[PDB]
Design a protein around this ligand. Structure first.
Ligand SMILES: Nc1ncnc2c1ncn2[C@@H]1O[C@H](COP(=O)(O)OP(=O)(O)OP(O)(O)=S)[C@@H](O)[C@H]1O
Ligand SMILES: Nc1ncnc2c1ncn2[C@@H]1O[C@H](COP(=O)(O)OP(=O)(O)OP(O)(O)=S)[C@@H](O)[C@H]1O
Ligand SMILES: Nc1ncnc2c1ncn2[C@@H]1O[C@H](COP(=O)(O)OP(=O)(O)OP(O)(O)=S)[C@@H](O)[C@H]1O
Ligand SMILES: Nc1ncnc2c1ncn2[C@@H]1O[C@H](COP(=O)(O)OP(=O)(O)OP(O)(O)=S)[C@@H](O)[C@H]1O
Ligand SMILES: Nc1ncnc2c1ncn2[C@@H]1O[C@H](COP(=O)(O)OP(=O)(O)OP(O)(O)=S)[C@@H](O)[C@H]1O
Ligand SMILES: Nc1ncnc2c1ncn2[C@@H]1O[C@H](COP(=O)(O)OP(=O)(O)O)[C@@H](O)[C@H]1O
Ligand SMILES: Nc1ncnc2c1ncn2[C@@H]1O[C@H](COP(=O)(O)OP(=O)(O)O)[C@@H](O)[C@H]1O
Ligand SMILES: [Mg+2]
Ligand SMILES: [Mg+2]
Ligand SMILES: [Mg+2]
Ligand SMILES: [Mg+2]
Ligand SMILES: [Mg+2]
Ligand SMILES: [Mg+2]
Lengths: 25, 581, 379, 189, 579
């Protein structure tokens, strides 16, 4: 019997960034 | 900053917050770190449920009570709510000014300690869009100088995966490991906490109930640590009395109530089996014998094993029973198992081992390792037994599977626990592991080339040893060898199939009547000792089901009728007296 | 659901960690038990302790709406918790609780909703009712041991047939009004029993309620005129038959004539070998007539003989006459033992795992079909 | 497509789980039945119960595009549901529904678009029509049994040769006018 | 808008070169563009084919009027991906910019959007291009069909991003683009010849444009045929325009542009010159002058190579069919690198010993786990694809699995090796050579007889046995390397001494080697089985090892003047040390 082959699974990375505000006056 | 930080001493003074009992070594090391000149910031790292927050929060309770070293007296401990700091930090610099102002208060008095539970969160808090300015960088220069003291608490997973990543912050914090307490150390803790739980439910706990709760939880509740685990049994036990009528059992909760709660939490049969279940258990052998005949020896082993478990004589960590039902074909090996779960009203975990013929197929049982596509799916056997810990595990045609699969069951029978890919440990203590194999069927049914035919019964046993390693066979409780169905039991089997036929016909509205003479004719016609009782299922289908089917669709049996079967001695053939009615 | 509810009240009345969790397979009415608790409170069936209590359902999607600025989600989350703590008699219900693990997550911040609620659950100030499936509870929720420790798992199991019929009787007035029809007592009994026997991959409460609901739309919308006010057992059988693709009581309909000519028609297309046609036509008749095994296929016949005598023709001409898909599988490809993976798919952690099994997927797509394994000996 | 349409209308009229899913191979009119349902509603071929209903074709790419924040998706998504929830007769059409299950609006988290509509579909508040291929139905779909439970499955089969030639005849005026040519009956066959 | 440049407006005011040829490929675009549905053309071609020229040229027909009535008012805009992604700094801000342009174009009817390098914006996962998830904002317009888009994706990316994604493939019509014929290439340059001539103010010769294309594609071996010709022509005009301070040559010659190709190709001008026949005529004289020994083996190889380059026979078959067979250490490897260095082709060494396992054979065609990595492809296929003119050196071919031999038989017969990815490799211009160190064991085998003096001297028979008869028929002739003579070994020793002397010159240390010393090194460093292989180690241990000990400490630290001698009685080397 031929040897088995394993397949890896790569997870993508994406994140959300907050936003600070600066009033003019 | 009174809204962001609460004074534990004030809360502990007016009320009480989990009075700490023991932990002298843990608290002494923490006080030693807090008395250092630099980097005096202990980090209570431990598994969930080991009293991490109790040690930090209980330090304040001890300070007010007075059982603390003079160096630690006069100090105020504050708990930081990271959620309140970021409440209105919409504008830039609101978090920095709010957080920096808080640290100034601690430096001014120079006698205050900050408790930050879930300290792993502050590592990234405060970053607005792409900045590294956060609580970690804002506190970092103040921890290495010793100006302020901060107590941390976090789990190993969070500490290793998040806190340990920041080497700078980790260096400032002195990791103080917390270990799970012993059985004796836990009972004194419950005794100290008991006055707080008794007042909530207005009940009383006995000295034996506490000792039983700790011991019983450790045995069955194997998913949580001992301090929290034992308290869950105690807190939930008192709740039952409150819900129950004030007059029946509201005063106190006996030890019997403790075992009942643990049984429901672990989904296992409770101790002190009631008379209702005893009647079903006692009659289990008789009920099984009415559905399977000629295998009374196998029924005795299955029923006796279950009785030992309920009676309290079961194995400490092994399953209820491990058996390898071997024998001829069609002799009841799988029927007895399928009819055992129904009698007990438990789920049936039927696994077809003819699919696990390759070594790589083992990943289905224990799940794929981390870092692969199959990690989310998880093990089919570990997941199935976790949902139904009280069930019958059936591995049909286990001999067909690869020998590698047998090795997986070594710990299932010797220790009773199987570790899934995710790290959880399945429990097989209340599972009746049953295995069926047809090994030696060719050898036992073969005829020797000699004058004196030989008893090849002993050839299947030799094949069982070649296929199964001795370490696997030794773990089995006993190997039951099924015997061929005799002519006397075949008659009973015919009645069983005829009864099933009546159920099918009852739905259509027609009743079947078969004379005893016809039943004997069918038995002798389809009686094959080597082939079991499956041929009997076909002599009835060809003789009875086939004519009835034609009449049901095309005949008088369309509507409810009373069909009759008779045998003519002159021709020795079946006669079907179909009636429309 | 008295046993399941009784444990919920016990957990909610605990001193600390009084946050019950409803973990069960999909379709077992986990949300119904949590939502149904409020319904019982109005009627007063619950005890005096649970009386004068309000149950709130949390909309995580709305909570995370318009929170782009820093600290917006924290303010909304810490504002709701204050309301629950102040009341001291309110209960929160979080449907699909596995979503709060990553809710409110920032670019590099770890300040999630679970971290904020965590110190309030152990203290016992607030009570939270969760409802997550076994798959989500293990892969996403069990991983956070700290949060799971503050919740008490309650295992919900699909009710028995005797219990499901009672559930439909209680829900029947709601479906009858919407569909302006009436369901007979036998119709409800048939839906539960038929669904278990035929409908698969769905749990009994959902399965039985699907047949009852779909049956109301059929009788209400299929006939343009001469509508049937009541819903008899015949209608329920057809709906189950469409969901499962096979009927159980239409055998004495026009299809009855097809079974009679099935043997004769096959003889015309395939001459000789009448004994083989009798085996296939009689097996189908017994199965359709209701005399089937109920635990085995319609029939398993090993046609063995010389080449060109009709082994692969009767089967091909049996599907065309019956109008069912033909699952033709050539066993000449499965020469080695390793070829079994193609039939049932590869195991987890290996290449081709997502592909699945050809035989399993084919049968799932066409449950009513003829499975032909040509040249089985070659395998 | 009256047979396929009849099954969809029966599901849409259900009290709960009235969310039919059109499952079929590529190029089998997966979206011709959803889009055509609106055409029938305007003409009036649909039953009276289905009259006054509006089909909305959601674009996941356009909605998901431009978020650049954690709460922008939920802000616009919930606004969409609010509109549908207000109109009890409104029906939503989500072409290529398999996209949301994989990664709707979150990566490295669990706040997906499907989870937002899971409680609404269970209560029958909104009607959703989905379209996904068999390959994208066994691998991507059905992994989250909760979402699969709400959505019913309608089998779509490739039409016969006699059915397609009739379909092309109905489409001849649109294609002929576009190209200003004529297609002979023999050429179509 | 500012992001996109109107090609029609640009063509109206000039500045766009005309399109020559590509009628069959360009006409396909007009066909799909006029379609009612699925009218988004896709230009799948390799780099340098001129995909942008086809789009720019298409707009020229619209303004000129050589298009149907529907395409009269049509306007084509080229999207600038760089403008959108630049300055975003926020995943999603880029998407907002695309919507504004899309809304503006959607309002106007008969509008086209030429999205150059579309693969960069729609990459499946993390990419080194656009790095934006434009799948969200590409399927809606493609599905809507309001505006049609032209995509200049590459063959590699198309097989992965477009093929895997059903939505993109179902709304795009592939338009295969291939390199133009050599005869068509000169016609393209002739049409564009006046534009470049008017700029540089120089007139190119008809022979230069024809010869430039032949040597450009062969010697550069970097880009494709269309880009090379336009580059060399522009490069040649610039060089001659400013080569002299005052003088100038308006005319151009073949020898002039040849020097320009040498710089970009990094090859001497002599080899770059179109003198293949000259080098082939003196091939034997060059190899014999560069390397010594195996004169009979080298001469046979030159006659055979001349037969293939003559043009006779089937062109599809490979040019190189040579099986070297002799003891190693005699320069067998050196002739393979010297031959390539003289002809100018590259050198690709593939050792068979590494490719021994059955699984390793698959690597040549494709990597086992390389599902994401389809750019690399098979090890053998990628090297041949990138380098179509290079020698393939196979060592220890005798010890290979049977399946490996069949891979060579296929290319020897058909001349084309297929790839799992789908790339087509041609061995027509690739010379194939393989060496086998077989028969040396049989010769060196000690006879079982009593006298032990039995010599085989028939090693050629063993060569035919280790190889199947089928392989022997494909190869026209096998090369055999005779055993070297003791006199020839002396020259090999001097080679290592020269390198050592050069290395010592940087420190100011001399090295003197006696004639008797060389004899000791030759015998010690030459082995019958291994040949000159031990010479490297023998020279190092005898000469360099002691030297370092004294060079580190002793008289040899400074002054040099090293001397070597050997005692006659014991035959041991003694090196005198002088300060
Ligand atoms: N020595 C102790 N005395 C009193 N209570 C204790 C003691 N040790 C543990 N406990 C109990 O342990 C619980 C407090 O610790 P936990 O609730 O596990 O908090 P924690 O360790 O911060 O949790 P996580 O999940 O790891 S953040 C309460 O039930 C305490 O009563
Ligand atoms: N002892 C028995 N009593 C009653 N029915 C029986 C008995 N043995 C077999 N049967 C019938 O035969 C079938 C059960 O066969 P099994 O017990 O599953 O066969 P087995 O012993 O596992 O052997 P196989 O066929 O080689 S896997 C059912 O149809 C039963 O009704
Ligand atoms: N005890 C019950 N009483 C009334 N209806 C019930 C009961 N159990 C199940 N149901 C019905 O089961 C169907 C599904 O209920 P749900 O609450 O959606 O189930 P669920 O398991 O919580 O679903 P998720 O959230 O998708 S895992 C509805 O028709 C319920 O009314
Ligand atoms: N009994 C029959 N009646 C009519 N046509 C037949 C008959 N037997 C064979 N044929 C014709 O011969 C073809 C092949 O017969 P099959 O029964 O399909 O062969 P087979 O048994 O699969 O053969 P193998 O593969 O060699 S064992 C049919 O498709 C018919 O065209
Ligand atoms: N058939 C042709 N007719 C006329 N000019 C052509 C032709 N093919 C190529 N060219 C010229 O070669 C160039 C092709 O356009 P380019 O923009 O260089 O192509 P490209 O495929 O975008 O190149 P990259 O970016 O290097 S992959 C221009 O200088 C064209 O004038
Ligand atoms: N019943 C039908 N009547 C008219 N046109 C149809 C019908 N079924 C399919 N079509 C046409 O065939 C195509 C169907 O595409 P569709 O199946 O929606 O694509 P996809 O499978 O990629 O989602 C469209 O061009 C549509 O107009
Ligand atoms: N004919 C020769 N002339 C000069 N040096 C030679 C000759 N034959 C062998 N050598 C020496 O032996 C080496 C053998 O080739 P090399 O590439 O080093 O190793 P291999 O033979 O294993 O490929 C030459 O590089 C050179 O050092
Ligand atoms: Mg804590
Ligand atoms: Mg069995
Ligand atoms: Mg629910
Ligand atoms: Mg056949
Ligand atoms: Mg579509
Ligand atoms: Mg060499």
């Amino acid at each position: 019997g031929k040897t088995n082959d394993w397949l890896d699974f790569d997870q993508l990375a994406e994140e959300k960034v907050r936003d600070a505000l600066k009033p003019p006056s | 900053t009174e809204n962001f930080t609460t004074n534990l001493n004030q809360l502990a003074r007016v009320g009480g917050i989990d009075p700490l009992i023991g932990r002298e070594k843990e608290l002494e090391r923490a006080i030693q770190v807090l008395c250092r000149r630099r980097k005096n910031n202990p980090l209570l790292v431990g598994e969930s449920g080991v009293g991490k927050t109790a040690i930090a929060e209980g330090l304040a309770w001890r300070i007010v009570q007075g059982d603390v070293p003079e160096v630690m007296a006069d100090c105020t401990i504050y708990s930081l709510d990271i959620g309140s700091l970021l409440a209105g930090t919409k504008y830039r610099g609101d978090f920095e000014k709010r957080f920096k102002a808080l640290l100034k208060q601690l430096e001014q008095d120079t006698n205050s300690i900050l408790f930050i539970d879930e300290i792993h969160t502050i590592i990234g808090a405060g970053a607005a869009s792409g900045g590294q300015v956060d609580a970690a960088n804002l506190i970092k220069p103040l921890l290495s100088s010793g100006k302020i003291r901060v107590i941390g608490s976090t789990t190993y997973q969070e500490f290793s995966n998040i806190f340990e990543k920041d080497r700078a912050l980790a260096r400032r914090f002195q990791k103080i490991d917390i270990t799970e307490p012993s059985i004796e150390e836990t009972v004194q803790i419950i005794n100290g906490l008991k006055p707080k739980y008794e007042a909530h439910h207005d009940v009383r706990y006995t000295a034996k109930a506490v000792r039983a709760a700790v011991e019983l939880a450790v045995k069955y509740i194997n998913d949580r640590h001992l301090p929290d685990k034992a308290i869950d049994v105690i807190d939930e036990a008192g709740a039952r009395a409150r819900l129950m009528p004030v007059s029946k059992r509201k005063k106190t909760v006996n030890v019997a109530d403790i075992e009942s709660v643990v049984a429901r939490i672990a989904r296992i049969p409770e101790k002190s089996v009631s008379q209702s279940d005893r009647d079903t258990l006692k009659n289990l052998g008789d009920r099984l014998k009415m559905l399977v005949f000629g295998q009374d020896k196998a029924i005795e082993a299955l029923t006796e094993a279950i009785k030992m478990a309920r009676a309290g004589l079961g194995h400490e960590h092994k399953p209820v029973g491990s058996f390898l039902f071997a024998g001829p074909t069609g002799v009841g090996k799988t029927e007895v198992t399928v009819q055992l779960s129904k009698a007990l009203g438990i789920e049936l975990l039927r696994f077809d081992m003819s699919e696990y013929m390759e070594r790589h197929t083992v990943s289905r049982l224990i799940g794929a390792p981390p870092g692969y596509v199959g990690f989310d799916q998880g093990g089919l056997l570990t997941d199935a037994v976790i949902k139904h810990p009280h069930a019958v595990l059936l591995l049909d045609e286990i001999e067909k599977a690869h020998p590698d699969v047998f090795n997986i069951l070594l710990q299932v029978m010797d220790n009773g626990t199987l570790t899934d890919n995710n790290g959880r440990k399945a429990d097989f203590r209340n599972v009746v592991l049953v295995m069926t194999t047809n090994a030696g069927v060719r050898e036992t049914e073969r005829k020797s080339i000699g004058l004196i035919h030989q008893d090849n019964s002993t050839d299947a046993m030799e094949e069982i040893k070649k296929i199964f390693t001795p370490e696997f066979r030794n773990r089995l409780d006993n190997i039951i060898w099924f015997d061929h169905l005799s002519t006397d039991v075949i008659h009973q089997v015919v009645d069983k199939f005829i009864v099933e036929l009546q159920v099918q016909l009852d739905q259509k509205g027609v009743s079947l009547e078969v004379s005893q003479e016809a039943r004997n004719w069918l038995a002798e016609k389809g009686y094959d000792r080597a082939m079991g009782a499956r041929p009997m299922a076909r002599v009835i289908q060809d003789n009875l089901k086939k004519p009835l089917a034609n009449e049901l669709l095309f005949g008088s049996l369309v509507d409810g009728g009373q069909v009759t079967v008779a045998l003519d001695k002159e021709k020795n053939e079946l006669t079907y007296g179909f009636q429309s009615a």
